[PDB]
A paper describes a structure:
Here we describe a systematic approach to generating modular and rigid repeat protein oligomers with coincident C2 to C8 and superhelical symmetry axes that can be readily extended by repeat propagation. Repeat proteins are composed of an asymmetric structural motif that is concatenated several times in tandem within a single protein chain. From these building blocks, we demonstrate that a wide range of unbounded fibres can be systematically designed by introducing hydrophilic surface patches that force staggering of the monomers; the geometry of such fibres can be precisely tuned by varying the number of repeat units in the monomer and the placement of the hydrophilic patches. All multiplexes follow the naming convention CsHRN_Rr where s is the cyclic symmetry, HR stands for helical repeat, R is the number of repeats in a single chain and N is an index to differentiate between multiplexes of the same symmetry.
We instead adopted a ‘Lincoln Logs’ approach that alternates non-polar patches that favour close subunit–subunit interactions with charged polar patches that disfavor burial. We hypothesized this would generate offset arrangements of the monomers, generating fibers with empty ‘pores’ in the regions of the polar patches. We generated such fiber designs from the C3 to C6 designs described above. We characterized the three-dimensional structure of two of the fibres by cryoEM. As with the bounded designs, the cryoEM model backbones closely match the design models. Like C4HR1_8r_shift, the pore size and twist closely match the design; the twist is −142.8° per monomer, or 71.4° per repeat. Notably, C3HR3 was verified to high resolution for the bounded four-repeat, bounded eight-repeat and unbounded fibre designs. While the radii of all fibres are comparable, C3HR3 has the largest repeat size; thus, the mechanical stiffness of the monomer may be responsible for the increase in stiffness.
Author numbering:
A (entry chain C): 1 to 465
B (entry chain A), C (entry chain D): 1 to 159
């Protein structure tokens, strides 16, 4: 009698009705007949396990699952569907009465892509991989217990199909213990986070990217539980110390989303330089707070910190107790940006110069020895040259080419150091003349560019002015 | 109404949205409007050459190209953007239905350094050189014919 | 972790990588390990003088200087390289923070022949002559004041 009820519930669905009508027209009636035979057999295989019948009702009421089943019975792979329903029956039986775990199954099997992936994994004769994976699910769910935040994170992580594929791949390779260790690390991360919406939100965001999850699995595979635990502790501390300020939390979410920054953070948390990362996050907080809501400076900070090499340089410099050098450098950058105002062509040169990591290392070196006014006057001379370029774009293009080179910038800082500032000024306007004399004859501009761009001829030319 | 489609596809990109927000912040309200006027003009210059407007949907939906265009409209070189979009149109109509040649154009104009170099060469009133060079590209493509190894070398060497 | 940055920057150079691989082949692995130990020791002997770390990042990046250092570590002259790096550290520390003088040192030590002559002159236990000569360089640079003609002539003559 239950089979007739299930058949009726399936047939009364309008989408199912339209699909069945289409498949009746196209001559595939025996495919529908085989599918209903499989449904009857699945009901008879469930028997007195009424929770399995309640699962099948939900699974077949969904029209997309029914459409996938029709496509998969058509091509003669109905035995794959029988094997899948047998495995699902075994998984629901072995759980017994864990209603939260059966709720997780009712959720995961309703999602079409998960059902398609499971069908594909049951076709190629890898049934034990699905069995082991459902066992791991039940185990992690029982371990979670009275801690609904962790079960919510687990449900969200499993709903993502890419993470589901990664989990199936790692279970296939018999890395089950690595997966168990990872869920234990998630448990001892959620327990530590407690009720704090920002930290739980950061976990919910970060753990959802496949790259970060793959990196985490690749580190816990080599028995590195302490590394991951201390990294989550450092992130919790960074959120707690951040206070209420959206612009810092945004940078944390961004930088931690970037995979290579997360790799560098793991490498520096392993070697017991944890307090270095703490002080670095403090320095970022100070830079953001002292840089107000000025969007130009904030964008410059985001571009500078998003680049991994500059991030590593900053880590190495806070490592050896020179945090105040980084602070003074960010102060000089903020000062230079404030004098730029809305003159976007000049701010573009700050973006180009500071985006080059070698020039950032040189600037940190030049600020450390307390020559900061040299850098200040050099930025002012760059402004007093760009503002004099006016509307002549080949000059500014030559200047973009010239200042990107690290050794030319070093030589310019050297000539500003020894008190010959005016000569540097006289150089830049002189270049303007060679442009204005050049006009539109690109061969002369090309020759001038080949004479300017190399360091030795540059230092020679600086000596003749 | 394809202009509205272009606007939606352009502002949908998050980096483009960030750039536009920044350019609204620092007090350059009219520069975004001038750029969108140039975009509207470029759309209505294509007319029924739907492949050209598809090429514009490609080019303008790239953060680097769009930022370069904004900065290059800033300091009064607006017309340099109008001229360039004209010449590309001349390159597309004269190119005809050689879809592989339009593929090479899509590849080349996506690279920001190529687009900046072309902006420099159209700025100083050497547009004829860019037009002749696109003609050389078309001719080398037709001469190469259906022989994809040579077209791959051509793509790499011009990239 | 600065030492790791030096190792990565050194091994990024293809020529240095090939030299290391070749010396791995011939059964001289402990010579490469001893050289890296000397590098570590000189770095941690430099301390918080980041200018000295920059000098080591420059001098050791050069492939010929690395080759000469490796060959001098081969035949049992490790202490000679250690003494030379110590003397360079002392000349940078006593040199103060005159950036032009440190530029002269960065120039003169990048030249391979000057480095080989200094190694030969530290080998024979004449350590103080090198330090005295660096003192003479410091004095001549500080006496030149701001007059780049003379500093250019001096760089040329000492090169």
């Amino acid at each position: 009698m239950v089979y007739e009820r299930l058949k009726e519930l399936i047939e009364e669905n309008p989408e199912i009705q339209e699909i069945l009508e289409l498949w009746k027209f196209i001559g595939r009636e025996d495919v529908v007949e085989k599918l209903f035979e499989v449904i009857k057999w699945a009901v008879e295989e469930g028997g007195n396990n009424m929770v399995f019948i309640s699962l099948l009702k939900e699974i077949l009421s969904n029209p997309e699952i029914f459409e996938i089943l029709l496509k998969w019975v058509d091509i003669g792979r109905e035995d794959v569907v029988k094997k899948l329903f047998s495995v699902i029956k075994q998984a629901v039986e072995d759980g017994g009465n864990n209603m939260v775990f059966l709720s997780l199954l009712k959720e995961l099997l309703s999602n079409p892509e998960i059902f398609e992936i499971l069908l594909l994994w049951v076709e190629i004769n890898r049934e034990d991989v699905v069995k082991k994976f459902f066992d791991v699910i039940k185990w992690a769910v029982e371990r979670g217990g009275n801690n609904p935040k962790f079960l919510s994170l687990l449900k969200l992580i499993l709903s993502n199909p890419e993470i589901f594929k990664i989990l199936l791949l790692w279970v296939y390779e018999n890395k089950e213990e690595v997966v168990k260790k990872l869920f234990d690390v998630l448990l001892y991360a959620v327990k530590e986070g407690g009720d704090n919406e920002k930290f739980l939100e950061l976990l919910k965001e970060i753990l959802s990217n496949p790259e970060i999850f793959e990196i985490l699995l690749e580190w816990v595979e080599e028995n590195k539980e302490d590394v991951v635990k201390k990294l989550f502790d450092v992130i919790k501390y960074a959120v707690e110390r951040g206070g209420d300020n959206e612009k810092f939390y945004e940078l944390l979410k961004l930088l931690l989303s970037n995979p290579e920054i997360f790799k560098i953070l793991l490498e520096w948390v392993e070697i017991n330089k944890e307090d270095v990362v703490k002080k670095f996050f403090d320095v970022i907080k100070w830079a953001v707070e002292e840089g107000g809501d000025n969007p130009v400076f904030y964008r410059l900070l985001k571009l500078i910190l998003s680049n991994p090499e500059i991030f590593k340089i900053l880590l190495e410099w806070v490592d050896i107790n020179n945090e105040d050098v980084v602070k003074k450098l960010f102060s000089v950058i903020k000062q230079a940006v404030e004098d730029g105002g809305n003159n976007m062509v000049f701010i573009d040169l700050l973006e180009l110069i500071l985006s080059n990591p070698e020039i950032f290392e040189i600037l940190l070196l030049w600020v450390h020895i307390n020559r900061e006014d040299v850098v200040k006057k050099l930025f002012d001379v760059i402004k007093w040259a760009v503002e004099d370029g006016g509307n002549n774009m080949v000059f500014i293009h030559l200047l973009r080419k010239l200042l990107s080179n690290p050794e030319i910038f070093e030589i310019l800082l050297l000539w500003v150091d020894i008190g010959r500032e005016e000569v540097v000024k006289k150089f830049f306007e002189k270049v303007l003349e060679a442009v204005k004399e050049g006009g539109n004859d690109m061969i002369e501009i090309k020759k001038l560019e080949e004479i300017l761009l190399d360091p030795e001829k540059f230092e020679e030319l600086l000596l003749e002015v």
